[model samples]
Target chain A: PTLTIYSGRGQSLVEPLVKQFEAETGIRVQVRYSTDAQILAALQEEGSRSPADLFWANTAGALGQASAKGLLRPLGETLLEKPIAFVPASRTWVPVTVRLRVLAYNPDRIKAEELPESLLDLPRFAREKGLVGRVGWTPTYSSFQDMVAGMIALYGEEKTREWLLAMKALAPKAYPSNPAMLDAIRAGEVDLGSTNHYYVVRFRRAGYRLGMHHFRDGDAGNLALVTGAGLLKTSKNLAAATRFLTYLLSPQAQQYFVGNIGEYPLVKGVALDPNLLPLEEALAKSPKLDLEKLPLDRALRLLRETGVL
Target chain B: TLTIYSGRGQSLVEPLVKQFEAETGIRVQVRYSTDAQILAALQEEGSRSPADLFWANTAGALGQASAKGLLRPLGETLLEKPIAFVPASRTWVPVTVRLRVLAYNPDRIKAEELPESLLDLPRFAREKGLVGRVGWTPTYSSFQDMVAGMIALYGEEKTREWLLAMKALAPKAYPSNPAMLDAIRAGEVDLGSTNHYYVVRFRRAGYRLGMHHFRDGDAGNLALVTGAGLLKTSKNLAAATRFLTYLLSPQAQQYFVGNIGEYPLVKGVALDPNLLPLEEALAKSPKLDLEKLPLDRALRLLRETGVL
Candidate 1:
């Protein structure tokens, strides 16, 4: 029997490993790839009619939405050999790859030297004074939105809006994608940019001169954006789906992600790239942003009202 | 107010648009979906589409939209460089480009046995007596772009005949590029057709597969561009034009090539070592004009040849 999956991740990212799983297990995986929102909405519309047994997401926002809709079943005896923070409180899903939100910069602009110690100080230290128009950001990106959602939780609405206004006044260059922001820094169009930590590794490896700061002061930028997998309650194939989840947590699968994709692997036994800060070191410094606790919708309004989105 | 329909991923465009919004104070609303889905969306919306711009990942998609008069003609600009796809009118601007390649296992295929052109590929398998030993990803967009490029360059009759000749070999099919490479690594097949970056990726992961570059600027060197254009019914003309200009700027062009590993349509930028100069690359390839490819006609041809 075929185990159907609705994955938001691009085919290129997971194709090789998924093929291996299918080959060794002989479990046919029928995949339907699309954007996170499309997949979430598709399941919502299909309800019981949806053929999907699993949800492989790109961001926590869509996964949160899926479980909130009661579309997901509670996963038993958590799959990931992860830190206590990454384990879902609801046990509805398990985190796979961990991506950190960090500051990215061009090393040669001589600008990468001036840095903010904490994520909060950025609006005043760099953005407010002279970094205006030179800072790269993606206000509309969902990962970025999740970061803002966390900010509103750590520092209430009033404080978050104040910082957003400062950011807008800084008049940052808005890139439609994170990699584009990395590109902007390499092009010398911007001195500082905000993006995930892994993209920095990709650019540096591409022979582009780049530097990054993983804000360890337990601030908004230090929040760990974990991508996870969930089991749909409507699934008639929970056993097969959980078997796939177990395979993803296996050392072989974790190493495929850690070595090739360069994301921080949550499970032990798989070592991260030498360029990356150790997960335990980063986790000790990172502030946990409850994906379920944040007011995601309200956060979006603040971003738009402040003209960030 | 600028509203864009992007068929590309968020990681690629959000950085540019967010920065533009921060600087210009012109708010942007982006709707993400497949280029073809968006094309059909615009067709259904007709004049009702709030879309001010269309950011496309391939010329085949743009060609479908442009033929419907959905785009506005540009009156003034500075983007006259070595472009991968030349639009019929000054209606769209290409920001980046990608070239197709043959991903092969060095251990299996002799270096001298590889074909010089994509047209010669089908015959090489038969003459080399390696039929049924080759693989192809018929469903990948890059392959579709190659076939579409063929039709745009050669007549439908010729392109159809050539595809029929290739499909006669019954090459093993793959659902994606990486899967094709994995099969080659496992010795299931000797070689397969794929985009250049896939090889770069496999090499980065320590895979033994290497790529065979085709003749410079030939139809074999199919160049598909990711492009953007203002819509004919746009209400925010000034903001739309400014965004398009920013996309074609050297800063954006550099991002397209350096970080993304895609080809750049702009000049004075460094290229991937796998690629030759864009000017020379375009000059050598026959049937390189991707904008002329009729996507629907090509899809029909693929089905007719059973390559789909």
Candidate 2:
């Protein structure tokens, strides 16, 4: 049987793994690649007539959106060892790989001991350490907003507002994305950056000198985000589609995500990239918060109200 | 406050600008756009344009502005760097250099079988039955810059001959070098011509792609230099001059070399180990004066040949 996959992941990172899947399963796979938003738009337009058997996205939110639209079919049961929080509220989508929200620091500039105990204390720490204008964050990125949403969940709106106001008052440099934020750190323009987990690894692999810091266990600083995949409800190749979904969480596929792509593998026993914290430690460090409840409108309103947006 | 019409991406250029402003205490405002859009704004606005500087990612746009008398004449000291594209009028100073290369799918094309000169490509494609299987970006300024270099080396007649011959092969046109590289990796096109860094960037992201330089002195090896110019009517000439000086400074030069992986134009800057030596690149690059480049004529040729 043949499976038509609509993947938002880059072809370079996806094609090799898909080829291996085809070799093993003898089920031919055809991937139509595009950005997450573009692929989602295509699927939205195609609806029940969509030719896609699987929708693999690099962002959990996109898969969640697809599931919300009733475009995804529930996997009967998933035999994976990922954190429960990493999976979506609806069982339609399963987490493929995990990326965390962490503070990217320059090793030369800041010491690990000096880091704030919690993300909420970061503003006070920056003020005390004279890192006011030397701090960077990307407010526009969905990941960053999700982290702020987690803040609203753990700490109320008033405290989140206070944190945002304090951080904005410090005059921290605002960046557009993790790469730019990392670039600012490398250039010595910013000492610490609020960014995703893999970007630091990605930059390190590219010969850049940078450091990633996950806050001590149970702090809101460590937020686990995920890339997810799901079968489309209208799939004609259900059996093959289900096989590919399980294959993605297999040991070999998990290794590809960890070794080749520098992302945290969702499977329990898969060894992490050398630069990353172990899966168990990363999970323990992450707060037990629902991904859906990670604030969107409420977080955006606080960011805008505090002028951090 | 100084205003800059920056044709470079804000993320790459803003950190440098931030450093410049903090050091000089000269608050600056920047308008970022593609090189073409930046050029169009300067052309449409003319001398009354509020721009104190134009930092373009491609030399062709700077040359067009220089030809239009939009840029101020720079002093000898500012353009003293040993880069290939130094202009006679001294309208702009070279910032960094990127080489045009034959980016090919290694699984499909072998390195040894590639031609010695870019001119041989059309015949090679025809002979190998690879016609209609190549990719190019005729609309990009770097591509136009390479064509300008061809005109400087081989006169209009031969350049036109080469253009029409390549056009006859029915190469696929991409919107940008990165897009063209994407097509190359996807096997949509067997080979393409693009700046060296795009391949480096793709490989860094874990994609497999091969970059091959034609034999030395080939126009395909043309070094496309990106530079900046000061607008003649800039109100903040001194601040702008200082900013220009900052761009050519060693630290700023290292940012280009170390961060972006471009060949630094200045003498003392450290080079990326993967880069083609500037000396070897200069030897390969067609000797062309930035001020005297026939940008209009090159565009005209591109249009007439229907390559645009």
Candidate 3:
């Protein structure tokens, strides 16, 4: 039997595991590799006639949108191996890996104790330090957009817009990517920047001089962005589809995600990468906001209006 | 248009080239082949080769090419890579670092039962009753490079003896490291010799594999390099140098670390969290000049042992 996978993860990351799945189960897999947004668009177009059995997405936002649109079948009450807080209420998708937004700072430039206590205080910090061009950010990054959407969910659209406008007025430097931002920080061009937590962890492990700082407990700056996968409602192979989902949550797969991809494993008991915060600590630090309810469109509009897009 | 002889695979380097072309407006034409094949072609062409640059997959090939006066010297400042990886010959600039490691199927083999060094592998395989269950890729350039590293560390005699002993056990031979790793996963073989990044890359998506490093200073734990250099016969030195400098840029170095799972040679580039730090990785690696690895002698020994 052939199981079709519409994968948003890159082929370099997914194909080897797919090959192993095929060899183990004696099932042929046909994958259509594309961005998560493109796959969601295609699924909406294909409707009931779609042959896809699984939708492996790169963002929980995409999976949540698909769930709301009825493109995903309920994952049902299969015992999830991860923290209960991360589980979707609708049960349409399972969180695969965890990445959170954190501020990356140069240890030589700023001390942990000297930094602002909350993400909301960044603009004031900029003003006090006169960090007109010393702060770096990647406003166009998808994760940055997700973080803005998270802010909209936690605070009102008005407050989020205020923060964006305030930061824009501070003349914060814009970078093309997270690594580039980290590079600039190390080169002394920037004192600090906002990026995903894993970027700093990965960079530090590579022998780069960098530091990661989390905002105060439940702060809006510490938003968790999960990459998840879901079973399609139009799947013809329910047995294989469910089996593959189960396989992904297995301890072996969980270890692979944590050790190889540097993403936080959802499953309990998987070892954390050295210097990585545990899921409990990470969740405690993240603000309580519904991922599915994030006002993505409003967030984008605010970003554009503030000239940060 | 500038031509390059790239021993690095198309899947990893193609995007970097496309980005380089996009940014510089310098079109590139590449010939993709194994390091050994590319070296042979360069030697055959000698001073008449059309390639402007040679991006090799292993340091041995680049060193041999430089030794033969086939490559031109590049500036130390332009590359700005780690001094340890920068060749003394100054003929090439390192793009990435590839550590040699033993990949085993954890489900099939226990950590305690594994060999302590590369030379102990043959004996350990026999004592553990893993005769035909051992896998290797003699045809792969990295594998041959490992053999060359073994020769440089242990000399030709012991390397030959170990080769013959492993061969006598009827070990399975695959066409490439990936193929061998696949065999390990499918239970066709319990162990496979491969570069560290292959296993990191395979497992990153979601595969069950274990990577083991040999004891400190073991040849099996050699830190080989993949680099690019200017060709002496090149007509487009300016464009080629531009391409060489581009490979050391932050964006290009990031791609290698994040996607290819290799250690970037450029300073300040982010590394994959899964990889060992350069200092720790170097501690396990033998202090061998990757450029001085005896490629010809290693190849000759493999042939004599019928492993080629």
Candidate 4:
């Protein structure tokens, strides 16, 4: 059997897993990798003639949008052992892994004690600490957009807007993606950066001087972001797609995911990487953050108001 | 009315905010910017700042803000379920979480050859025929935090010495995690340390890099880092509080976990399918406390390490 998977995740991470799957299943898998927006647009463009068997990506928003647009099929119970909730609670997508939003810093340019305890303090420092021109982040990335949405859920529009204005004044060095921002930080072009936690970990493993800080307290600091996987509605290989989804959630796959990927696995009883943060610790210290209850329109307005859009 | 500003990515928060507006009928307006821009705006706006909230991925900028008296203490009710090591002063609260780990190419090195802790990387880097290499974001705030953590755990002098040595022997520096991933996958470097998701996202994108767990406990499995916050100058206080409440709700948290590939702050939320199993992740011991991290001093020490 043959399966076609359309993904926005980078080829570096997924190719190995696909090869492994192909070897194990004896099924020919054709994978198409592209940007999240591009993948979504392609699916829309392809319509009923889409060649994708599964729609895989990092952010759930894209998948949720797809499900809302009827771009995905209703997954069967055979693929999911438990009731999966994908943002809209309609089960149009299934979450596969979790990553945390965090601050990335250069050990040489910034000090720990000088770090902010909450997200609210960034503005003051930017204004007073000569840090305005020395920091970086990407606003266009969905992960960042998700962070803003979390702020809206935790704080309201008025406050969120005010924060956005303050952020705007920092004159941060904008980048095309989290990797670009990290690059700026690495090169000493910027002293600090904000991004998903795993990026920092990966950089650190490579012997970069980067460090991470969890906003210990505040409405904006306590939330964690998640990634999801789902089957597309236009998929031609339902059986193969079902097997792939099941494999993603299987114990062996989950174990490899946790051990080799450093991300927290969603499957119950799967082992995790010893070097990563403990799930219990994250949960214990994590604040009650809900992405489902966020107001998208307000978030969009805030982004526009902040000129992030 | 209270207002909040975010200095991180805006996309992650959009969906959650939309749901909040629907549930509470309270409108929220958020402004998004890069970390540097957000800080500059805060400084430029000063007391006239229109914002009531300030949020970023790292606490360094926020700490500077707090020192400037730009933030007001949050009331007890505002921080009902605060995370550990977060400021008790209630000016800010952490939202999301992350940890530092190694990214390696398993095909190049045996598991036994890996270092037991990040501290051992310097020696490993200098070793002949070393099968692995390490990379980091030396200029990033997260790297400063890791240095701070090391100082707190291993003392400043030792941390500095180790950093200096690592700087000399480690792999060539790269700009960001993605770049580092590229370098490792392309054989420019053998391994790197980063947050777990970058590797996961890459794998999902079709990368063949392997992630290594630096076990042996002892502060290696760092704590989660939160990224968002509420500002004190917000004009939409009611809306912001409502939004905050909504974000804490199970339904919304579940959405965050399901959509963005992140862990949930609230209990009982479902885990994302692409992440490490929750049960196994929860089994580690002696969880690192966020409060104990000596962020400021660590930055100073790292500054002396010559990598900057």
The best candidate in terms of TM-score: 3
TM-score of every candidate:
0.53, 0.52, 0.55, 0.48
Candidate 2: misplaced stretches above 4 Å?
A1-309, B33-48, B67-70, B75-77, B81-84
Q: Provide the lowest-lDDT 10-residue window in model 4 chain A.
A: A79-88
Error of 3 at B122 (Å): 32
Highest lDDT: give the candidate number: 3
What tens-digit string does per-residue lDDT give for candidate 3 at A260-301?
456676766344544567677888898887786678888889
The C-alpha stretches of model 3 lying farther than 4 A from their native spots are A47-50, A79-84, B1-308
**TM-score of structure candidate 3:** 0.55
Query: After TM-score superposition, what is the CA distance of residue B162 in candidate 3 from its true location, in Å?
Result: 23
Which stretches in model 4 have alpha-carbon errors above 4 Å? A45-51, A76-88, A128-130, A255-262, A268-275, A283-305, B1-308
Clashes of each: 27, 1, 0, 208
Model 2 docking grade: incorrect
Model 2, A93-123: lDDT tens digits are 8888888888989998899778987898899
Q: Could you give candidate 1's per-residue lDDT for residues A100-196 as a string of tens digits?
A: 8888877776454467777667878764447668887898787788888888888889878877887777777899887777767766788776677
**What stretches of model 1 exceed 4 Å from their correct place?**
A47-50, A78-85, A111-113, A127-129, B1-308
Cα lDDT of model 1 by residue, B1-308, tens digit: 89999998775677567656866799999999989899999889988889999999877678778888898887545346435465767678777776677888798677777877777888888887767878887787778877877777667887888788777877899987767876787687888878766666555433467677677554567766788888998988898988888777654554555435566686545443444556765555555455666677778889988787
lDDT of 3 by residue, B1-308 (tens): 88999998886677567656766788899899988799899989977789999999888789888988998988867745554678777888888888989999888778877888999998888887888899988888778888888888888888988888889879898876767876776788998788888787556434578888899988789887888889999999999999888777655665576646787676544444455776788789888877788888888888877788
What is the lDDT, from 0 to 100, of the residue A111 in candidate 1? 51
B204: Cα error in model 4, Å:
14
Docking quality category of candidate 4 according to DockQ thresholds:
incorrect
